[PDB]
Symmetry: D2
Subunit: 234 residues, 4 copies
C-alpha cells in the first residue's frame, strides 16, 4: 500500500505568532503557494492518490483542494475527520507565543509545546478561542471532544480512524493521501516508525512537501519514508 | 428542505471557443473569480450548505472549493457523481464552435446546442477527446457511460442520483449545495419546475450565482426559486 | 466479477392466492426452508459472497439472513434498496387472483400478469395495500415511488442502482449476492443476457436456488449462468 | 435520543461450558428462542429501532435478524464492527470453564473472568481458536486486532466507534439498536452510567431482554435505563 502525507503551510496566525490548535485559521498566501508546490511535486513524481483524508480544519482542506488541482486529481473521493485535527492547544489557543514564553519560562514553554504527554492548560468552555459547540463537530459524542491535548493524546484519538477507516483503503490497494497537521502527522509517523516517546519531540515534518510511505500488508514501512523533494526536506 | 445550485464560470476552453462536454477542462482565471463571488454571496445571504455534491468534472469541483472557502464552510461532507456531469458533447468535444457553425449551418448547429433531444454524433472511443476508459469512471457499469448526449438524456441519467442520494439529504433536513454544469443544472431545474420539453431551451442559468430552491416535503418548490444576486442574474 | 442471485421462496399470500407486489408479506414456513437450502448450496458449491444486496421487503431479507446463517457468512456487509423491490402490483395488491381473472377476463388478466409494458391499474394512496408514506421509503424522492408497475418499469428503476452501486462492488472484485424477487431478478437477467421484450415473459427463476453469473470487465456474461442445483432448477 | 441494547442468548459453547470470546460460535436453539422473545418485546413495547449495529459475530448477528423479524423491521440499515465484539478470551478460548476453575483456583480464575484490567494469557496464532488472519477482519489494521483482552481494553477499542459512528445516528435523532455481547455491552453501560472500575464486575446484563436508555443531547441517561421485561431481567 502507499500513503502520502502533506502538512499544510503557514496559516495567518503562524505569521502573527499565535498558537493555533483547533481554531479554524485560514491558510496564508504563502501557505497557498506551498499547497500548490506540494501538488506539483505529486504530479512530477507520479504519486497518484486514489482517495483523500483531511482534518476538519480549513487550512488542511484548502491545502488538499489546491494541491489536488495542480496534480489533476480533484475528482477523488474525500473523507474528513476531527481525529486528523491538529493538537488542541487548550488555553494557549489565540495566545502570543513570545508572551507565553515570557509568562511560563523556557522549561514550561518547551513542555507545553513538545513534551510527549503533558498537555497545555485546559481552555475555558466559554473562551473566544474555544471550539466547544462548533457546528462541524455536532454529530460527535460531545464528551470525547478535547479541551487540550498533548501529542500522546492526539495519537490516542487518531489511531482508531487510522485503524478502521484509513486502513480499509490501504488494504484495498488504494493510494491514500492525508492532508493534516504538524502534530497529527508527527503522531502518525511516531506510530508507523516506532519512534520513542523521548525521541519524537525532535521530529519536524516540512510543510508543503509530500511524505511518501510504502507499506507492507501489516501497514508497516517496507522501506524508509521519502519526501518528494528530499533536498528541500533536509 | 433547501437546495442551492451553483453553475461554474468559464473554463479555459470556453474562452478559446472549444466545445467541452466531458473533457476535464480547467476553470479560467475569471471562472475562479466568479467561484469566489459565488462563495461571498453564500456567506452574505446567509445560505449555509450542510453537504456538497459535485460532478466528476474539475471545473465544477474547483468552483465548489473556492466558493466554500470564501463562505468558510470548507469542512462539509462532499460527494461526487458522473450523473451530475455536463452533457457529453459527442464528436463535437474539443471542436472549435465557430468552425462547427460553418460546417453545419445556423440550423443543425443551433439544434445540437439547444434542442431538448437531438444528440451530437457519438465520439469514437479512440479520440483524444473521448472519456472512454477514464480512471474516474472505472467503478461505473461501462455500458451506461455516454458517448454522446442530449439534454433529455442528461435528465434520464441524472434523476436516479437525485431521487435516492440527494433526496435523502434534503429529506433529512440538510441544506444541499450542488456545484454542477449548464445542462445538468437546467435538467434539474426543468424537473423541479415542471418546464416542458419545448420551454426548457429558453432557460438560461447564469454562472457564478447561487440559485436557491426552498422545497416542500415532496421536493417541489415551496415558493419561487431565487438567485442570491437577482439583479446580476437578470441582466 | 461473480454475481449470485437468490429468489425468495413463497410468502404467506401465495398460498392464500393474493397478489403481493410491494406489500410486505412474511416468508412462509416453506419459504424459510428453501432459504436454508439456498444457503446450504452456497457452502456446498463454494460460492462465498463478499457483500449482500437486498430489497426493502421482509421475505427477501429473511431469505438472505437464513441463507447466510447456513453459509456461515452472516458477517458480510449488507445494503438494501427499494430498487431491488418486487414489481409493484397496483390496485391488484392484496386482491384475490381468482376474482381478478373473473373481473378482467383471461386476456386482460394475462396482460397485467405477464406483458412487458402494460402495468396493472394504479393503486390509490388510501388503500390499506398502498405503500405510499411507508417509513422504509421516507428518504426517497416521493415523486419516483410507483403506484403500479410493469416489468419494463421495474427494469427502468433497477438499472441505475445496478450501474452505480452494485457495479462498484463487482468492478472492485467483490462477489455480490442479491436477494430479491421474481420480477426484479428477471428484469436483471433480461438485461444481462439481452433477452427480447418478447421472450422474458417465458423466463422463470426457481425459488430457493442460487443462480450464479460469472461476468467479464463489462459485466456481461463470460459463460452461461448456472444454478447451484441444476436439476432442481430445470425440473 | 433512544438506545436499545440486546444481549444475545446462549451459544452452543455456552451450553457445553466452553469459553467463547471471538470464536464465531453459533447461537443455541434456546438462544434463538430468546432472540425471538427479544423481538416480541420490542414490538409489544413500541420500541422501533431505525438502525442496527452489531459485532462481526454470528451469535449476535443472528439475534438481531430473528429479533427484527419479530419486530417487523427487517428493512433497517445495518452496520457491523469488530469494536462491538465480545471480549477476546485469549488462551481461555475453547477451554472448559470448570476445568479452568481447577487449573487456576477460585481466585486466579476469577481474575481472568471478572477483573477490570488484567487480561487472560494471549492465544497462539496457530491455535485452532485464534481469530488471527480471519477474513472478516482483513480490512482492519492487523496491528490493533487483539490476541487477548480485558474489559478495560474492550472499552478502549469500543469507545471510538461509539463516539463517531453510533453517536452520529443518535445525534441525528435516530433510535439505535445494538445487538452485541456481555463484555462489550457492560463496557458501554459502564461508560453511559459512569460506573467505577471497581463496581463494574458487579453488573450483569441478562440475555434476550432489550435494555433501553433514553439519552440527552450529551448522550448521558436522561432517566434510569430500563429493560422491556423488568421482572424477568431482575429475576
Amino acid at each position: 500500500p502507499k500513503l502520502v502525507l502533506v502538512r499544510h503551510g503557514q496559516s495567518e496566525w503562524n505569521e502573527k505568532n499565535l498558537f493555533t490548535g483547533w481554531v479554524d485559521v485560514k491558510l496564508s498566501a504563502k501557505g497557498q503557494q506551498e499547497a500548490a508546490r506540494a501538488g506539483e511535486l505529486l504530479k512530477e513524481k507520479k504519486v497518484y492518490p486514489d482517495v483523500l483524508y483531511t482534518s476538519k480544519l480549513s487550512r488542511a482542506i484548502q491545502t488538499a483542494n489546491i494541491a489536488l488541482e495542480k496534480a489533476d486529481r480533484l475528482w477523488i473521493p474525500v473523507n474528513r475527520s476531527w481525529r486528523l485535527n491538529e493538537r488542541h492547544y487548550g488555553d494557549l489557543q489565540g495566545k502570543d507565543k513570545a508572551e507565553t514564553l515570557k509568562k511560563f519560562g523556557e522549561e514550561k514553554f518547551n513542555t507545553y509545546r513538545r513534551s510527549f504527554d503533558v498537555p497545555p492548560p485546559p481552555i475555558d468552555a466559554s473562551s473566544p478561542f474555544s471550539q466547544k459547540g462548533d457546528e462541524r463537530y455536532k454529530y460527535v459524542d460531545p464528551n470525547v471532544l478535547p479541551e487540550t491535548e498533548s501529542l500522546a493524546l492526539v495519537i490516542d484519538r487518531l489511531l482508531p480512524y487510522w485503524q478502521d477507516v484509513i486502513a480499509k483503503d490501504l488494504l484495498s490497494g488504494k493510494t491514500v493521501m492525508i492532508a493534516a497537521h504538524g502534530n497529527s502527522l508527527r503522531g502518525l509517523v511516531k506510530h508507523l516508525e516506532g519512534i520513542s516517546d523521548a525521541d519524537i519531540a525532535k521530529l519536524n515534518i516540512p510543510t508543503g512537501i509530500p511524505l511518501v510511505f510504502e507499506l507492507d500488508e501489516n501497514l508497516k514501512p517496507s522501506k524508509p519514508s521519502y519526501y518528494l523533494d528530499p533536498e528541500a526536506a533536509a
